[PDB]
Design a protein around this motif. Structure first.
Motif, PDB file in Angstrom:
ATOM      1  N   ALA A 181     120.393  40.596 -14.117  1.00  0.00           N
ATOM      2  CA  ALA A 181     119.499  39.342 -14.063  1.00  0.00           C
ATOM      3  C   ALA A 181     118.328  39.978 -13.083  1.00  0.00           C
ATOM      4  O   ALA A 181     117.313  39.235 -13.193  1.00  0.00           O
ATOM      5  CB  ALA A 181     120.266  38.221 -13.526  1.00  0.00           C
ATOM      6  N   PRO A 204     121.330  41.489 -24.395  1.00  0.00           N
ATOM      7  CA  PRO A 204     120.288  40.312 -24.544  1.00  0.00           C
ATOM      8  C   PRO A 204     119.423  40.354 -23.464  1.00  0.00           C
ATOM      9  O   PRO A 204     118.449  39.646 -23.353  1.00  0.00           O
ATOM     10  CB  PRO A 204     121.418  39.171 -24.265  1.00  0.00           C
ATOM     11  N   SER A 205     119.368  41.197 -22.397  1.00  0.00           N
ATOM     12  CA  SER A 205     118.508  41.419 -21.153  1.00  0.00           C
ATOM     13  C   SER A 205     117.618  42.551 -21.342  1.00  0.00           C
ATOM     14  O   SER A 205     116.558  42.851 -20.716  1.00  0.00           O
ATOM     15  CB  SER A 205     119.194  41.537 -20.111  1.00  0.00           C
ATOM     16  N   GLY A 258     127.746  40.325 -25.956  1.00  0.00           N
ATOM     17  CA  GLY A 258     126.509  39.623 -25.423  1.00  0.00           C
ATOM     18  C   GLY A 258     126.309  38.418 -26.471  1.00  0.00           C
ATOM     19  O   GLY A 258     125.875  37.355 -26.170  1.00  0.00           O
ATOM     20  N   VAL A 260     129.160  36.827 -27.473  1.00  0.00           N
ATOM     21  CA  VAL A 260     130.023  35.933 -26.931  1.00  0.00           C
ATOM     22  C   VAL A 260     129.617  35.569 -25.646  1.00  0.00           C
ATOM     23  O   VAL A 260     129.529  34.291 -25.308  1.00  0.00           O
ATOM     24  CB  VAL A 260     131.393  36.600 -26.834  1.00  0.00           C
ATOM     25  N   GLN A 261     129.147  36.387 -24.481  1.00  0.00           N
ATOM     26  CA  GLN A 261     129.039  35.862 -23.305  1.00  0.00           C
ATOM     27  C   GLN A 261     127.934  35.003 -23.143  1.00  0.00           C
ATOM     28  O   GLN A 261     127.819  34.047 -22.444  1.00  0.00           O
ATOM     29  CB  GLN A 261     129.042  37.058 -22.287  1.00  0.00           C
ATOM     30  N   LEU A 262     126.859  35.581 -23.782  1.00  0.00           N
ATOM     31  CA  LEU A 262     125.400  34.535 -23.697  1.00  0.00           C
ATOM     32  C   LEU A 262     125.107  33.933 -25.051  1.00  0.00           C
ATOM     33  O   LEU A 262     124.266  33.101 -24.951  1.00  0.00           O
ATOM     34  CB  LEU A 262     124.234  35.597 -23.540  1.00  0.00           C
ATOM     35  N   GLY A 263     125.699  34.373 -26.056  1.00  0.00           N
ATOM     36  CA  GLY A 263     125.303  33.582 -27.382  1.00  0.00           C
ATOM     37  C   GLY A 263     125.982  32.492 -27.737  1.00  0.00           C
ATOM     38  O   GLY A 263     125.677  31.592 -28.568  1.00  0.00           O
TER      39      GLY A 263
ATOM     40  N   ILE B 168     124.110  25.560 -27.313  1.00  0.00           N
ATOM     41  CA  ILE B 168     124.944  26.839 -27.224  1.00  0.00           C
ATOM     42  C   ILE B 168     126.179  26.497 -26.265  1.00  0.00           C
ATOM     43  O   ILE B 168     125.860  26.364 -24.943  1.00  0.00           O
ATOM     44  CB  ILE B 168     124.130  27.957 -26.475  1.00  0.00           C
ATOM     45  N   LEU B 170     129.119  27.653 -24.105  1.00  0.00           N
ATOM     46  CA  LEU B 170     129.570  28.885 -23.249  1.00  0.00           C
ATOM     47  C   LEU B 170     131.200  28.557 -22.771  1.00  0.00           C
ATOM     48  O   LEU B 170     131.474  27.399 -22.495  1.00  0.00           O
ATOM     49  CB  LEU B 170     128.711  29.461 -22.170  1.00  0.00           C
ATOM     50  N   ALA B 177     125.431  32.219 -16.389  1.00  0.00           N
ATOM     51  CA  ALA B 177     125.412  32.554 -17.620  1.00  0.00           C
ATOM     52  C   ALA B 177     124.560  31.719 -18.543  1.00  0.00           C
ATOM     53  O   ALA B 177     123.820  32.189 -19.284  1.00  0.00           O
ATOM     54  CB  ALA B 177     126.810  32.532 -18.288  1.00  0.00           C
ATOM     55  N   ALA B 181     121.154  32.827 -20.255  1.00  0.00           N
ATOM     56  CA  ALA B 181     120.869  32.713 -21.797  1.00  0.00           C
ATOM     57  C   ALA B 181     119.699  32.215 -21.744  1.00  0.00           C
ATOM     58  O   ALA B 181     118.773  32.567 -22.846  1.00  0.00           O
ATOM     59  CB  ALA B 181     122.001  31.898 -22.195  1.00  0.00           C
ATOM     60  N   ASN B 184     116.588  34.881 -21.087  1.00  0.00           N
ATOM     61  CA  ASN B 184     116.352  35.820 -22.211  1.00  0.00           C
ATOM     62  C   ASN B 184     116.143  35.282 -23.653  1.00  0.00           C
ATOM     63  O   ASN B 184     115.895  35.760 -24.668  1.00  0.00           O
ATOM     64  CB  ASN B 184     117.526  36.905 -22.185  1.00  0.00           C
ATOM     65  N   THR B 186     118.350  33.872 -25.650  1.00  0.00           N
ATOM     66  CA  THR B 186     119.300  34.145 -26.377  1.00  0.00           C
ATOM     67  C   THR B 186     119.836  33.066 -27.422  1.00  0.00           C
ATOM     68  O   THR B 186     120.087  32.011 -26.768  1.00  0.00           O
ATOM     69  CB  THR B 186     120.791  34.621 -25.588  1.00  0.00           C
ATOM     70  N   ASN B 187     120.005  33.586 -28.529  1.00  0.00           N
ATOM     71  CA  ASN B 187     120.020  32.497 -29.798  1.00  0.00           C
ATOM     72  C   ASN B 187     118.953  31.422 -29.646  1.00  0.00           C
ATOM     73  O   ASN B 187     119.113  30.271 -29.886  1.00  0.00           O
ATOM     74  CB  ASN B 187     121.341  31.699 -29.945  1.00  0.00           C
ATOM     75  N   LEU B 261     119.355  37.186  -5.868  1.00  0.00           N
ATOM     76  CA  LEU B 261     118.699  38.072  -6.852  1.00  0.00           C
ATOM     77  C   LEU B 261     117.649  39.019  -6.215  1.00  0.00           C
ATOM     78  O   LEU B 261     117.404  40.146  -6.730  1.00  0.00           O
ATOM     79  CB  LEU B 261     117.969  37.502  -7.873  1.00  0.00           C
TER      80      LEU B 261
END
Ligand SMILES: [Ca+2]
Ligand SMILES: [Ca+2]
Lengths: 281, 281
Positions: A181, A204-205, A258, A260-263, B168, B170, B177, B181, B184, B186-187, B261
């Motif tokens: 991240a 995804p990153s 990706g 799974v974990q983020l989508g 989405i 998770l 997470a 998502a 980025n 994602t989806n 971060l």
């Protein structure tokens, strides 16, 4: 025919690989029982040796810790890591290691696509020559990665580079999601991250893993392992999972984890997509 | 006789714990460092046994300490603080000092562009944006989407309904997470379930929208100190009163972001906030 027990570890990749093994056996008339994402490695290890689970994905390099050969240089050789895990687990527990996946899910460095593409970085050898020639990199990693002799110091000597304090961000914990991240959002100018090869956040990153071509780190290739009692009662499992795991390269497994974990997609649906698109279902 | 400063194991405990430590040290109060001792039940056992003296606690957590979990008073900041203050004084002689305005509770954060573009600052603005055909797909856990106290309760209070097309789901409850998502996209994700002051919010370019009707219990951080320790150094209340009043949501987000971060040590981020605000220099 007793239903074969398919299991996996608690991580995201365990769910993907476990549902891949589970869906393939069901598609060929083999009855199964679901024990996916049972627990950590010691839990899955004692369960398979006791007959509570039958088949699950294990990593070749993890045999270094099962059989008291932790730091052996043989685990740095992908081929030698597979046969030694295959030979030791068969002799000690009568577990049969099937064809492994090419993905090396070990400690490594991922850079942003722009940094790798613009400077033609595909390996850690390119990484060493890029920064030694004054390239700008800020690597986000844990203090454990930066300080322990087996990680970044071992990378630095083998690939001929040294990162100055200005090019390092040391995080408190060893969670690779935070480093990913940091480079994805470029916190404190970071453009590289400490990762595991197929971490769910890499694709995804917008990150690319640089290959450890001189093999500094131990190899961790996932492979389905099955109890010999179960495999010879329905022997087709070996040949059916052979090309399935052969097409699970680093990039494919990165994108499945990706999704799974983020989508948010269920691992069962992501597994069935991969198999139908590759003609196995 | 040193005052034992402690905190919980997450990033904010370290930041708030290091803030309490330096404010006390700069005013001649010698202290003992016990920051990030463990989770909430461990820190609850330490202060009730006299092993630690002061640490940052959240007002809404008193609902679980005193078996009043779902009481509607915890959705009021003023009543949640006074009830937490009085119950802990009667039960353990723990004194709740002046709290911070930041509400570290369950919520929804959007990307800055969608907030800026549609003038989103609260969940009431958010609800009418969806009611008017707005563009939103939310990254959240299955618990957040289904549990009556979370998204359905938000939907009832703010007059909107999110379609399956706009969700989405998770697996875990880790907000990093969901934030990653939406960071980025994602989806197509542009919103994320969060906790108010999560460390990833600011470095990911997210804005949390105000829970203006207070659907969720309020969790405002406050220093709590044993009465025995406070009566020997009574100035501690006036020293930490203006410091915590300066710790609003965005201020705590950026301090947590530089630790979680940015890699900066929690103590240096505390000393920076205090020196920039005139509490140290
Ligand atoms: Ca650091
Ligand atoms: Ca889902």
């Amino acid at each position: 025919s007793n239903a074969v027990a398919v299991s996996s570890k608690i991580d995201t990749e365990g769910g993907v690989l476990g549902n891949i093994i589970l869906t393939v056996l069901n598609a060929n008339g083999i009855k199964t029982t679901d024990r996916i994402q049972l627990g950590a490695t010691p839990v899955v290890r004692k369960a398979i040796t006791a007959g509570e689970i039958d088949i699950y994905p294990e990593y070749t390099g993890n045999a270094a810790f099962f059989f008291n050969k932790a730091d052996d240089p043989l685990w740095k050789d992908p081929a030698k890591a597979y046969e030694t895990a295959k030979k030791l687990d068969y002799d000690a527990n009568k577990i049969v290691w099937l064809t492994p996946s090419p993905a090396n899910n070990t400690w490594g460095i991922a850079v942003r696509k722009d940094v790798a593409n613009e400077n033609k970085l595909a390996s850690l050898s390119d990484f060493g020559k890029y920064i030694a020639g004054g390239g700008k990199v800020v690597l986000a990693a844990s203090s454990e990665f930066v300080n322990s002799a087996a990680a970044l110091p071992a990378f630095q000597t083998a690939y001929g580079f040294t990162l100055k304090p200005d090019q390092l961000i040391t995080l408190s914990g060893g969670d690779t999601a935070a480093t990913i991240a940091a480079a994805a959002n470029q916190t404190n100018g970071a453009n590289a991250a400490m990762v595991y090869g197929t971490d769910g956040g890499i694709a995804p990153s917008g990150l690319v893993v640089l290959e450890d071509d001189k093999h500094v780190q131990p190899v961790y290739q996932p492979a389905p392992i099955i109890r010999e009692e179960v495999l010879k009662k329905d022997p087709k499992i070996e040949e059916l999972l052979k090309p399935v795991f052969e097409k699970l390269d680093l990039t494919t497994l990165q994108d499945l984890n990706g999704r799974v974990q983020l989508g948010g997609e269920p691992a069962k649906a992501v597994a069935e997509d991969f198999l139908k698109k590759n003609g196995f279902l």
